[PDB]
Symmetry: C6
Subunit: 216 residues, 6 copies
C-alpha cells in the first residue's frame, strides 16, 4: 500500500483478513466496506492480490473482471494515450490496463500516485472494483425489498432488521431508496403495528416508530 | 486514523475488534467505550468504515443514520456555508455531510484535522455517533432501573451488580442518576438487608454498605 | 498512552488483554499488576477506557468510582484551583476531576504530562484506581489469613501456596504482613511438620522449611 | 525482504502464512497469488526460505527445483559472466545460481537490488519460481476445461463456478483462454439454459447470461 | 524495556507469553531461558511486573522474594550508600531495593541504565531473579540424576532424553555435571547397551554412542 | 537480533514460533530452514535462547552441544587468541566460546558484528548449529534412501514424494545425492511404470516422468 506517502507491501494480516471475510460471508453487503477498509492506500497490484487470492466464487470473480474491462475501455475512450517519446522529467499516461495493474509495474503505479499533481490510479481502480462487487452483491441477494413484509407475530424490530438488510443490497439511488423507506416500510408492516404507526403521523423518526410498536 | 499528527489507515486488528464486539455483545453499554477507544484519532472515513462493516442490526444502524442526519442539520443551521471562491491559502467550511464523511474526501478531513487552528471533524462526528449509540443501547435495554429489586435470597453484591448494569443503560443526567442511586438502591433492597443499611445511617459508602450485608 | 515522550492511542491488543483478564480472573490479586503493566504511560483517558470497557462487575466498578471521588476530593482540599486568566505561556492547575479524566481533554492531559516540570496526572490517577482495586480484591477474597491452616495430609508446599495466595489479598502493611508470615505460617502448620520446623530453629529460610517437610 | 529500500528479515507471520496456505490448499491456483503477495520485495534468500520450509509435497518441490535450474541455465547462456578482477567501485554479474540464491550472499543480493541501475534478482527469481508453480498447479488439477459440462439440474451459477475454477489451472494463453470462454462455456451448458443463452445473442455479458438462467 | 537505548513499556504479548509459560510448564527448566528472553533489556519495573502477574505458585514466588532479599542485603554490604546531597550533574547510588525496583522509580532505573558509564540494574536484578528461579526449578524436580537408570527394554535415545532432562535441573557446577555425564550415563545404562558402549572405548561422542545402541 | 544494522531483542512471536515448530515437527528436515529463517540476523545470545527454550529432546540438544564444542575447538586451533592488553581503539579476538555466546556479552557480540570489517559471529555460530541439527535430522530419519521402493499399486507421485522426503534427510553431498536421483529413483520404480520411464529415454525431466506414469 502507501502510508502517509511511503510505499509498503500489503500485510499478511490484511491478506488473511480479506480471504477470511470472503470465505465466511460470501458477498454479504458488509463485505464491500471491509474490502475498502482493508485496501486503504492500495496500489493496483495490492487490489489484484486481494482479488486473485479469493478461491472459489469464480463466476463472481469473472463477472468482476468483465466490469473492470468495461470501465477500462470507457477510460481509454475518454483518455487516449498519445504515441511519442516520454521526455526525461515526465511519466506516461495510464491506460485502462495500467489502472487495473495488468500492464503497469509497481514503480509506474507508485510514480502516478506520488507525482504532483497525483494521478490516483489505486483509488480509480478501487472504484471500478467496487462497481463490480455491487453487481455481485445484488446477484447474491435472493430477495427484493418489495417482498419484505412483516410477519403476523414478528416483533417490529425484527421486520426493520430484515427491511434494511434487503435495502442495503438493492440497486437503487438514494432517491429511490428514500422512496422505498418512506413508502414500503410502513405499507408492508403488519395490520396491528401499521395502525399504530399511522396515528404517529407521517413525519415521525425511526426511533419513535420502533418504540411505538414495542408493546404490540 | 491519525497518530501524534501523521495519517494512518485503520488497522486490520482494529477493524476486526469492532466487528467482533458488535457480534458478541450487541449494544451492551460497554460497547460504546470500546467503540470510542478503537476510534481514537479517527477520521470520519474511519468512523464510517466501522459503522458500515457491522452486518445485521440494520434497524439499529438505520436509527444511527437518522441521529447523524439530525445532528448534521443542526450543524448547518448553526454554521451556514458561504458561496464564494476559496482563496489559495485556505480551506473551506465543513457542512454536516462533510463531518459525517459523506461529502468530504480523506484529504479534506485531514486538512481540517491538521490545519491550525484545528477543525476537529473526527471528534465532532464521533460525538454524534455516540449520541446515536446511546439511543440504541437504551432501546436494547429491556429493563427500567425502577424494576431492579433485590430477591429474597439474592446476595446484596448480586443486586448491586444488576442495579448498576441497568443504571448504565438509563437515559438520565448524572443528577437524575445520582437521585436514582441515593433513592432507589436502598429502597428496593430486600427487607433484611434494608433494615441493616438504615442503621448504618444515610451517608455511608458503597463499600461499607456491601460489607454490612455480606453475612445476611 | 505515551511512549519515551510521544502520544499514542491505546492499542487494540492492550484493550482486549484487559477485558479478557477481568472476564477470566475477576479480581484475583494478579489482576492488579496486570492492570498496571497494561497501563504503562497511560493518560487518564486510557485508564477510563480500560475501566469503562469492563462489562459486568458493576457493583465493583461503582465502588471504584466512589474511591476515585474520595481521592479527587482530598486532592482539591490540598490543591485549590485559583480563579484567574491563564497567561499565554502557561497551563492551568488540574482538579480532582481533571486527574480522573472527567473534566479534562486529552490535550490538557498531554500538556500536564509533557510540560516541564511534569504534572504526572496519569500516574496520580493510576494510584487512585489501584487503591480502589485493592478494596475490590479484598472484597472478592472470601477468606482471612487467620483461617489458612494445614490439612492433616496436605503437602507443606500446598499449604504454603494457600497461605501466600490469601496473604496477597489481605489489607495489611508490610509490617503486619511480616508479622503474619513470622507468626501464623508456622503456628498453623500441621502437627508433624510443625515439630520439624521448630527443630530447624527460628531464623530458617522458606526454602529450608519447604525442603524440611518434603518427606513428611 | 526490502521495504521502500531498507532491508528486513522475513517475518514470522509471513513464514507461518506460507506454510499454512500450502498445508491447507496444496497447489490450488490461489496459492500462487498468495505466494507472490507474501514475497513482495523478497530477496532470493527469502524466496528459498519459503520454498524450503514446505514439508511434504517433495515431488512438487523437486520439479520446482528442475524448472529453476532450466531458467538459470538459459540465463547463463544469454548473460555470460566474464573472468576478471572486479574494480573497487563495482559489483559482479549475477549467474543463474546467484539469482536462485544458491551461490550468492544476502549482501550480494542486497547489492544488486539496491545498486543503480537496479539488477532486480529477487523479482527475476520470483518469476522463475512462479513458472515452476504453474507447472505444479496444472499437475495438481485433475480435470480439463473440456470436461466441465453443466449438470441436468445444476444451477448455472454452479456450472460457471466450476468452469472458471478449471480454466484458472489450464496452461493456455489469454487468447486460448478467451477462445475457451467464448466457445466452451455456452457449448457445454445444459439444454434448457443453452437455448436461453442463444436467444440473448452472441455479445451478452456474463452478468446478463447468469441472470438469464436464474429462473431455469 | 529498553531498545537499542530508547525506553518502551513491556508489551501485551510479552506479558501474555510469560503468564502462559508459567501456567502450562510450571518451573520446568526451559522456563528460565524463556524468562530471560522475554525480559531482554528489561528494567526492574518490567521484571517485577512479570513476577507479580504470576497467579498461583505463591510458595515459589515467596521463596523468590527471599532470594532477592538475600542478594539485596549482600549488595548493600558490598556497596554502602553515602549520606549527602547529590550534586546537580549526578545521580545517586542504587541500594538493593533500588535494584529490585521496590524503592526506585522508572526514571531512576532509566537514569542508571542509560548514564555513562552504565549501572545496569536491570541485568543485575535479572541475575538475582534467575538465582531464585534455579532454586525453584530444583525444588520442582522430583528426581535426582543418580536415579536415572535405563529400563530393560528402553531405547537408548529415551534413556538419554531422561538423563539430560534430569541433569538440566540439578544444582551442580559444569565440572560436577561433566563428571555426572562421564560417569553416570554409561554406568546406569542397561546391561546389553553398556557392553556395547565399553567396546567403543572411553572417548567416543554422544552421536556415536547413540548410533551404537540403535539396533539393540 | 540486528536489523539493517540496529540491535533488537528476539521477538515473543519468533520465540513462540521456534518452540512450536520443534514441539510439532520434532526434527523433520524443514525444521532447519525454519530455524535459519527465524534466526535471520541473530546474535549468539539469540541462538542460545532458541536452543535453550526447547523442552524435551534433551539427547538431541546435548548432541548439538557436542557438535558446537567440536567446532569451537577447531576454531581455536585455527585462530589462537594472543595475550596482551587490547588498545583503546580496538576489540579483542573471539574464541570458540565467544562465538557460541558462552563467554561473550551481547555488547561484545554486537561489537564484532557491527565493527568494520565485520566479524560475523552470529552467522559463524549459526553454521555450527546447523551442522549439529543436520546430524540430529539424520538420527531422527528412520529410513535410508536405498529402501524407498515404489509399491505395486502406489501412484508414482506418492513414490516420488517419499523418495525426495527421504533424500532430504540423507547425509550426502549434492554429487552423491545427484547420483541417487539419477540412479535409484528409476531403478526402484515399480515394474509397469519403470518400463514406461525407460521408453522416455535417459534425459527426461521429472515433470515428463511424472506425467508419463499418471495413467498407469
Amino acid at each position: 500500500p502507501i502510508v502517509q506517502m511511503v510505499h509498503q507491501a500489503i500485510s499478511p494480516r490484511t491478506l488473511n483478513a480479506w480471504v477470511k471475510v470472503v470465505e465466511e460471508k460470501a458477498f454479504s453487503p458488509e463485505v464491500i466496506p471491509m474490502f475498502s477498509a482493508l485496501s486503504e492506500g492500495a496500489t493496483p497490484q495490492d487490489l489484484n492480490t486481494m482479488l486473485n487470492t479469493v478461491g472459489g466464487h469464480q463466476a463472481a470473480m469473472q463477472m468482476l473482471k468483465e466490469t473492470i474491462n468495461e470501465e477500462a475501455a470507457e477510460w481509454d475512450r475518454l483518455h487516449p494515450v498519445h504515441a511519442g517519446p516520454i521526455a526525461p522529467g515526465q511519466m506516461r499516461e495510464p491506460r485502462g490496463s495500467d489502472i487495473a495493474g495488468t500492464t503497469s509495474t509497481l514503480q509506474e503505479q507508485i510514480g502516478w500516485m506520488t507525482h504532483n499533481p497525483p494521478i490516483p490510479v489505486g483509488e480509480i481502480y478501487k472504484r471500478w472494483i467496487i462497481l463490480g462487487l455491487n453487481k455481485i452483491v445484488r446477484m447474491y441477494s435472493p430477495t427484493s425489498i418489495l417482498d419484505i413484509r412483516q410477519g403476523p407475530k414478528e416483533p417490529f424490530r425484527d421486520y426493520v432488521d430484515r427491511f434494511y438488510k434487503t435495502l442495503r443490497a438493492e440497486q437503487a439511488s438514494q432517491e429511490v431508496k428514500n422512496w422505498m423507506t418512506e413508502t414500503l416500510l410502513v405499507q408492508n408492516a403488519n395490520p396491528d403495528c401499521k395502525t399504530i404507526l399511522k396515528a404517529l403521523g407521517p413525519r415521525a423518526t425511526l426511533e419513535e416508530m420502533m418504540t411505538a410498536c414495542q408493546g404490540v
